[PDB]
Amino acid sequence: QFNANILRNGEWVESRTGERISISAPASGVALGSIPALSQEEVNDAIQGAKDAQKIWKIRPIHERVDLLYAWADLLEERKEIIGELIMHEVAKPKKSAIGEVSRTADIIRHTADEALRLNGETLKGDQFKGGSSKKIALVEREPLGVVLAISPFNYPVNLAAAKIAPALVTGNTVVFKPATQGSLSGIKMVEALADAGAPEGIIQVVTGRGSVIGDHLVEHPGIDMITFTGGTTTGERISEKAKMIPVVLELGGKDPAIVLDDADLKLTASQIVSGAFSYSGQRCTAIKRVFVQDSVADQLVANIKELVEQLTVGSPEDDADITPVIDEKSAAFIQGLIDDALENGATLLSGNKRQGNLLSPTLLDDVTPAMRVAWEEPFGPVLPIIRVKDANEAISLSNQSDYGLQASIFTKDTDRAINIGKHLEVGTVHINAKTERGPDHFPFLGVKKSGLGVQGIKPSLLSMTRERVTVLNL
Amino acid sequence: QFNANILRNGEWVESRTGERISISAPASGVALGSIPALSQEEVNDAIQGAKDAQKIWKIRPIHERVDLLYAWADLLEERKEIIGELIMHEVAKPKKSAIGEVSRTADIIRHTADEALRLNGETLKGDQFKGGSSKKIALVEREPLGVVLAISPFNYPVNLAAAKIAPALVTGNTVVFKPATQGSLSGIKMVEALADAGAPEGIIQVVTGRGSVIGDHLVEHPGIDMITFTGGTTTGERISEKAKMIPVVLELGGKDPAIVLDDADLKLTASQIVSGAFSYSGQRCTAIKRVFVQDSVADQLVANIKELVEQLTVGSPEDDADITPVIDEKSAAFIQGLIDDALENGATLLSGNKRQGNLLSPTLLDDVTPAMRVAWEEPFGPVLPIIRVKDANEAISLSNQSDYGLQASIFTKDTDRAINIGKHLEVGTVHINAKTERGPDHFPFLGVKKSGLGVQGIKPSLLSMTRERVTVLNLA
Amino acid sequence: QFNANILRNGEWVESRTGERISISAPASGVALGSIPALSQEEVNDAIQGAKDAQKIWKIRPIHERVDLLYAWADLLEERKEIIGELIMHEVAKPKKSAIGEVSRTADIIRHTADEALRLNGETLKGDQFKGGSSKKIALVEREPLGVVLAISPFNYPVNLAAAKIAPALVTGNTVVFKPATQGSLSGIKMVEALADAGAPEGIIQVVTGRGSVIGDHLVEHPGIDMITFTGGTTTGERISEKAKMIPVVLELGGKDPAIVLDDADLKLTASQIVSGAFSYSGQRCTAIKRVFVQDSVADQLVANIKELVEQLTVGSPEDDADITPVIDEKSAAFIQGLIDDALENGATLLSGNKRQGNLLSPTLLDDVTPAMRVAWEEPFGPVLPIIRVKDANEAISLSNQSDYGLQASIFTKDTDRAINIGKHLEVGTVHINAKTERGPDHFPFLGVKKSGLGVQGIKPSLLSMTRERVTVLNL
Amino acid sequence: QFNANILRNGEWVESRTGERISISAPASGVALGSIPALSQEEVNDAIQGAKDAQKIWKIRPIHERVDLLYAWADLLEERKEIIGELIMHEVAKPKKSAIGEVSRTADIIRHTADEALRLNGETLKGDQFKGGSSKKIALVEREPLGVVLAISPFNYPVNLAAAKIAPALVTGNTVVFKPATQGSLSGIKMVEALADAGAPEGIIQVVTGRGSVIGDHLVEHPGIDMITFTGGTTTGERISEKAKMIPVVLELGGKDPAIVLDDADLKLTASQIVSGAFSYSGQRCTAIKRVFVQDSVADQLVANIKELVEQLTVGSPEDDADITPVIDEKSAAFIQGLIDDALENGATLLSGNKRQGNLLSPTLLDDVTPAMRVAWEEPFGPVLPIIRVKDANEAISLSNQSDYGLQASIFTKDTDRAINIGKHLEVGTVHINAKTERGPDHFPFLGVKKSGLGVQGIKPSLLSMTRERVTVLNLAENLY
């Protein structure tokens, strides 16, 4: 029973009122712990402290900021089981991958620290541009922005927090961290590790509380020099709308399509599709959520997908099931309504439409069409629609008609064609003969259209949290 | 005179509203031309044509996009006398500097084309990260954002129009171009060259009209995928507040300080200061606008500066005077409040606080204090305040107190000292023993705090108007 | 006749010894002109001259050195027709291909100019390394090595002369330029254009003469700080063995294989192969010289190849014949030998074992084996051997069994497999579904094993012409 | 008490021919152990093993190549004290500095590993060059060269050995390792840690032997695709001369000048000068070995320098003396002759000529002239000349007259001028207001003129270990 406190200027404190928010395991209903519900004034307190501390943190030598990240990473890898079991219970993530998230987070932090140590500067002579004549040399370097607001999702309460926090701190920014409420105990345990590593006072502040007590206030605060957000599209749009005069990075929803051509390896395709679509029960922005399959191979493809779906284990997070309960009641009803609309409008159900409360069985729908909601709306749940298609050009048209633009998969033996087709897809990343995915973490990661704003991935993140400082000398 | 049309979908037209906005020459108050006053509906057409044309434009091989920039620049350079004369008249820019603007524009266009040509992609192996597959390979390239809204100011109505347009187009975007109303005719003439150079239909659209009609409408339009703005801080902040879900780039106002220490070369310093401050009669975002001088050398530096300020010729743009008339009545009056507020508070007038209409003499003010408006407020006029300072630590503080953070200058024999002082100034670019300035145009250019957002210069312009496209190949 | 002089310290002179070497056209035997045969002491004069001029040239601002290159490129382009006719005559190169050499040379010169202008330095903080810790900053810029000896081949007397001179000069070096005797008139005309454009005195020095008199002397000279050479492997090894304490760049012989798999478009394959193998009658280091074709498609491919080879126009340079006379008497007899050896051991002559003095019929040999010389030795003439092979695996082994490692081509619709096969071939560049080639000239160009040393191409060449200069500040 | 074996093909073996070479502490003459003196065959055998393992190693996922480095670094750090102690005895290096060599070594190996992870490829399009094809794409990557011959000095027998081996293996080359014979025990112990870290068989081979029975044969071997060498200039020369058709990287001798102008902080200068010149008794390629000092300030600086020099302790490596014995008899004899000639040509002895066998007092000479050998010849010993100069201009000239060109120092409060001056100096690196040094190791390191060939430091090392690998694809043009 973790009745967690929050971190402000180096000490672990409670809200002044004493008010708290209750957290329970999605799979069980069982009381897990509580977090402080913070007021606007304590938000102000945390931000001011981070600004203050940023002035002493930026001036530290890079290798010192690098060593804190490495010590923090080591402690997470040390506490892999403990933190892992808390993620499992807190967001109903299957055991091994709750542990796997913590391992990967320590890997992301280390790589980020090492990358920061290799942000070389550059020098430019004045006469490299016509009319500049050569007496002056510019020293270009990178400078932190100040105070980074980092907002993480329930999805990956450790990974997608640390993926933000680590580049901000290592480049000499300070961080105000606002975890998703569900995922906040997990997030707090991650930060406890940072504090135990010796994070100086104020370098990282944790802020918890309801979406409408402190949300806009945080986003509109003149002390915030940068926002990175992962989460729902709606919230992200609102954040963009309300934010003023600062860089903002957004990673939002996805409706990633897998395009399947008739020359495809249909056994590889089915495997990658089922893997990418049903991971963490479909609760992921980056995941295959749409299949566009050419007519001639559809029947064999579907029959392959049906077989693997029916092997997936349904049950408890603790039992390491493939398909675990969804995050809450409200989510379950949403996926349900999508399933309903499909079947009403004449979809073939090949597998599923079964549940016990939040625990939904894996659902496979065939003969899905554009008239169906499940063809566009991100379910964030374990449902996969198949849309039969005439050729590549129809797959592209429907793919691009999505408000979404995160990732796309293209399955085909002909790699040259796949490349050409990918160029016509409005997505951040196209995967050839492979499921969509965020990592490996050094690759650029980004959504366009309503799937995001800015760029993440290890090095792009470092860049987004800094700016050019030019020094001009006369030689 | 020049009753201009605007470009939409490769055709030159006037407004369906039947309305025009009259443009006058600021030096004479005589009519020069006019532009269409478009409707929000004409803005939609422009934006829609731009989006359609982008789908075709973006598929063009790079060398073809690069070849259009070259054709454009050659025609510009070729018409430099004609366009220069129109700038000169439209914005009261000294004759040789207006022609020089076009020269610089043609150069900026070519360098941008040159740089876009040498944009290489990158490959990354999985397992360049622990413990990625190996034989998974990402190919990363730059992809255009879509439709770029470029908004330019009156003071460089070609240079700062083309600096936005050339990187957008060459990287595969299309552009909706909104010039400052004053400077519109110069902007249209620059676009004519681009059209004569053979720009395909819809890749560049020109929008003109009343702020109350089209301003917020452009910045809030869902078909705009990026905004790049140069202009006043207040407008910039408003653009930022109102836009959503897209990148925004802003170069805004500045109040560049020049810190002059005990050991400075006071002749080079005076010279650099006056050149930087009074260029185009101070109507520049990047310009020394504040002098913090160690009181020890203050009397000497002020006698050097006064000499050079009285050296500046004052007169008409056609005569190539150093000081020409300010952009308008409103501007002249604003500068006047600043000067008057300073004297009213006991600052010392060293050189002319005199006017004829909107042509003001260059004004030097000594004994300025943190209590006077002109200590902080960007005049956009020919006035220079001098503030006496205890030491390097007082100038650093007074510098940083400003809302602005564009550039600064440090004048001292002690390079080592200047570098560490520069470190403590919240600015984009610190110049040692030289004036502030935007170029050379390959240097990164940026303001921090209220001075800007995002970054400019040739290569950072190219980055700002694109995004990573990743294609991951499976080789297993 | 064009009785050329050479350049030294700004003036065009003949040799003090009064001697000269005659140059006649390889196609018609007509006297074209002559060059001075310099002494070792005139060579010393050239190098001392270049040395002194460099101290002065290196201190020019970069923008002035690019402008010289621009003026030179503009002059060569204006002289396309004139310099182009000399080349076709001097080295029996087809008229359109000879004029194209000049156009391309100008492009190379400008692109090399443009790229030198945007070479920027880097800065490094001491704290980017454990320890370091502070206000130590390294300013890493680039410095010219000194005097460059550029040695060019017969086959591209202007292209491959200027591709060495242009990057050396632009980066602050001076050049001692040694053209092939056969190709020297064309070389010297390219230099006339440099000098007419305002090249400072001693910046560019031309040396001509007998190999037995000047060759080893040039290569072993203490005043030479860098050598770049293109020519035969044997001569190249002698350079490498004899030079000392200096960077040496070599591009030597090739035996580029074309590997043709089962699934290849045999029409596109035949066309790429013939075009590459028989361009300039095979007198090219980069050129398909071996075909390894899988048994199943060999009949068809060899039919496709035969058809295209018989279409080849064979005759005069002025007539833009596909196949024109090979460089000299030695060359043609050596090629006859290779053809002769193959025939005497069981190879099948598909097309053209016809000789007309130095004018050689394109020769296509089928059923070639490992026991035949022509499977291995570079002919530098219009002969192509087809080797029939079991599979990819056998193709790779026979490819790598060559002493040469220049380039290779892979023909297959399986792009993924082609890439993987490419990784197992020991060559600089692998071309998938296209012929081997040096250009486009921004592409790095290099051979490994006996094919070469170091790297060429626009940027790699610039790099090879300079070294790092570090300045470390301590604040 | 260390009769060491060599590594070939995963097994720690001995010479079949059975011969060894005994190694002795230079400070003592007391035995330390022996190394095997190898034959021409056992040397080919090592080269072949490396070539066969090259084809297995090079295709290992890059992350697997870096994990081996990390592991090796950890084990070295762990064996700080054991390895460090061997170094202080074997090459007579002050105790804490020898352990420091092992610490820094693991630091170089880790940073090299991470740097390899970041060697990204590039793509070029055909139409980036006039007339080029828009449907051509070149994928450019880096490929190992093959088997790399690493030849390290007595100088730094762990540090300058690993600085060559690490970048080589992590970029997918294999190594034939030849330590300086004096230093071979420390290098063997270094290699042991790599083996115990899990190095696959063949990737690293250790070749030991006299230095002629193996010397030329190695450098001339067609099985070698790259040479990297640190040592004497004369040896470097021979290698460049005798090798053909491969890249050759050389780190050779220096005569780094210290330039001291009128407006200099003479306390900091004096301290930087002494720390750098006399570090490891002057047995460093990178070290101040010449002071050009302006006349108006000469007396005061040379007064300061005298003081710090008399503060230097003299004795054995175990005691952590500043000045320990020089490597051998030959070297000390040669150093003595440089002092003699200088005194013989009338140089003022400012302090400590004194020498008892191997151990030499730090020696300070003043009024040193261009006619004296010690103004030019790298002594590799605890001797430092002062050259009284008129200006920077004379300092620049006399500086550039040396055949050497490694590094240099300028001392001044006038930073811009120092930057100007440094530019006329024919060296790889100029240090402003600080001593010359190789580090920090991410900094590019090179000697020009007779001081070397090619470039080192962490990244530049990786590039010298590889070559471009280009794959050109045809981009499909349309569909639709």
Coordinates of C-alpha atoms in Angstrom, one line a residue, chain D residues 78-236:
Chain D
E78 CA 38.9 -3.9 -11.3
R79 CA 42.6 -4.8 -11.8
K80 CA 43.8 -1.2 -11.2
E81 CA 46.3 -2.2 -8.6
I82 CA 47.7 -5.4 -10.1
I83 CA 48.2 -4.0 -13.6
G84 CA 49.2 -0.6 -12.3
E85 CA 52.0 -2.1 -10.2
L86 CA 53.3 -4.1 -13.2
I87 CA 53.5 -0.9 -15.2
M88 CA 55.4 1.1 -12.4
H89 CA 58.1 -1.7 -12.2
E90 CA 58.4 -2.6 -15.9
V91 CA 58.7 0.9 -17.4
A92 CA 59.6 2.7 -14.2
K93 CA 56.6 4.9 -14.1
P94 CA 55.7 6.7 -10.8
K95 CA 53.2 4.5 -8.8
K96 CA 50.0 6.5 -8.8
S97 CA 50.6 7.6 -12.4
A98 CA 50.9 3.9 -13.5
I99 CA 47.6 3.0 -11.9
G100 CA 46.2 6.2 -13.4
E101 CA 47.2 4.8 -16.8
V102 CA 45.0 1.7 -16.3
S103 CA 42.0 4.0 -15.0
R104 CA 42.3 6.3 -18.0
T105 CA 42.6 3.2 -20.3
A106 CA 39.2 1.8 -19.3
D107 CA 37.8 5.3 -19.8
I108 CA 39.2 5.4 -23.3
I109 CA 37.8 1.9 -24.1
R110 CA 34.2 2.8 -22.8
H111 CA 34.1 6.1 -24.7
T112 CA 35.4 4.4 -27.9
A113 CA 32.7 1.7 -27.5
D114 CA 29.9 4.4 -27.3
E115 CA 31.4 6.3 -30.2
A116 CA 31.2 3.2 -32.4
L117 CA 27.5 2.9 -31.6
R118 CA 27.1 6.3 -33.2
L119 CA 28.8 5.9 -36.6
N120 CA 25.7 6.6 -38.6
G121 CA 25.5 6.0 -42.4
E122 CA 24.4 8.5 -45.0
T123 CA 22.3 8.6 -48.2
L124 CA 23.0 10.6 -51.3
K125 CA 20.7 11.1 -54.3
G126 CA 22.0 11.1 -57.8
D127 CA 20.7 14.5 -58.8
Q128 CA 22.6 16.3 -56.0
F129 CA 25.3 16.6 -58.7
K130 CA 24.5 18.3 -62.1
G131 CA 23.0 15.8 -64.6
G132 CA 22.8 13.0 -61.9
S133 CA 19.8 10.7 -61.6
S134 CA 17.0 11.4 -59.2
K135 CA 16.2 7.6 -59.1
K136 CA 19.7 6.7 -57.8
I137 CA 20.3 6.5 -54.1
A138 CA 23.6 5.7 -52.5
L139 CA 23.7 4.2 -49.0
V140 CA 27.1 4.9 -47.6
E141 CA 28.3 3.0 -44.5
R142 CA 31.6 2.2 -42.9
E143 CA 33.3 -1.2 -43.2
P144 CA 36.3 -2.6 -41.2
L145 CA 39.5 -2.8 -43.2
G146 CA 40.5 -6.3 -41.9
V147 CA 43.4 -7.3 -39.7
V148 CA 45.0 -4.3 -37.9
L149 CA 48.6 -4.3 -36.7
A150 CA 48.9 -2.3 -33.5
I151 CA 52.4 -1.6 -32.4
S152 CA 52.7 0.2 -29.0
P153 CA 55.6 1.9 -27.1
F154 CA 57.1 1.5 -23.5
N155 CA 55.8 5.1 -22.9
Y156 CA 52.2 4.0 -22.2
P157 CA 52.1 0.2 -22.5
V158 CA 48.4 -0.2 -21.5
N159 CA 47.0 3.2 -22.6
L160 CA 48.7 3.5 -26.0
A161 CA 48.0 -0.2 -26.7
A162 CA 44.2 -0.2 -25.9
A163 CA 43.9 3.2 -27.7
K164 CA 44.6 1.1 -30.9
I165 CA 43.0 -2.2 -30.1
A166 CA 39.6 -0.9 -28.9
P167 CA 38.7 1.2 -32.0
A168 CA 39.9 -1.6 -34.2
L169 CA 37.8 -4.4 -32.7
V170 CA 34.6 -2.4 -32.1
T171 CA 34.5 -1.4 -35.8
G172 CA 34.8 -5.0 -36.7
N173 CA 38.6 -5.5 -37.5
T174 CA 40.8 -8.0 -35.8
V175 CA 44.1 -7.3 -34.2
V176 CA 47.7 -8.5 -34.3
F177 CA 49.2 -6.8 -31.2
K178 CA 52.9 -6.2 -30.9
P179 CA 53.9 -4.4 -27.6
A180 CA 57.2 -2.8 -27.0
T181 CA 59.3 -5.5 -25.5
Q182 CA 59.9 -3.3 -22.5
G183 CA 56.1 -3.1 -21.7
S184 CA 55.2 -6.5 -23.1
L185 CA 54.3 -7.8 -19.6
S186 CA 51.9 -5.0 -18.9
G187 CA 50.4 -5.3 -22.4
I188 CA 50.0 -9.1 -21.9
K189 CA 48.1 -8.5 -18.6
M190 CA 46.0 -5.9 -20.4
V191 CA 45.1 -8.5 -23.1
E192 CA 44.4 -11.2 -20.5
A193 CA 41.5 -9.0 -19.2
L194 CA 40.1 -8.9 -22.7
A195 CA 40.3 -12.7 -22.9
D196 CA 38.7 -13.0 -19.5
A197 CA 36.0 -10.6 -20.7
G198 CA 35.1 -13.1 -23.4
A199 CA 37.0 -12.2 -26.5
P200 CA 36.2 -14.8 -29.2
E201 CA 39.2 -16.7 -30.5
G202 CA 41.5 -14.9 -33.0
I203 CA 40.1 -11.4 -32.7
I204 CA 43.1 -10.4 -30.6
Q205 CA 46.5 -12.1 -31.2
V206 CA 49.6 -11.1 -29.2
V207 CA 52.9 -11.3 -31.1
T208 CA 56.1 -10.9 -29.1
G209 CA 59.6 -11.3 -30.3
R210 CA 63.0 -9.5 -30.5
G211 CA 62.2 -6.8 -33.0
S212 CA 64.0 -8.0 -36.2
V213 CA 63.1 -11.7 -36.2
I214 CA 59.5 -10.3 -36.4
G215 CA 59.9 -6.5 -37.1
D216 CA 60.1 -6.2 -40.9
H217 CA 58.2 -9.5 -41.6
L218 CA 55.1 -8.0 -39.8
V219 CA 55.2 -4.6 -41.5
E220 CA 55.7 -6.3 -44.9
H221 CA 53.0 -8.9 -44.5
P222 CA 50.3 -9.0 -47.3
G223 CA 47.9 -10.2 -44.5
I224 CA 48.0 -6.7 -42.8
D225 CA 45.4 -4.2 -44.0
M226 CA 46.4 -1.4 -41.7
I227 CA 49.3 -0.3 -39.5
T228 CA 49.0 2.0 -36.4
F229 CA 52.3 2.8 -34.6
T230 CA 53.5 4.9 -31.7
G231 CA 57.2 5.1 -31.1
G232 CA 60.6 6.5 -32.2
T233 CA 60.8 8.6 -35.4
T234 CA 63.5 6.4 -37.0
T235 CA 61.3 3.2 -36.4
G236 CA 58.3 5.0 -37.8

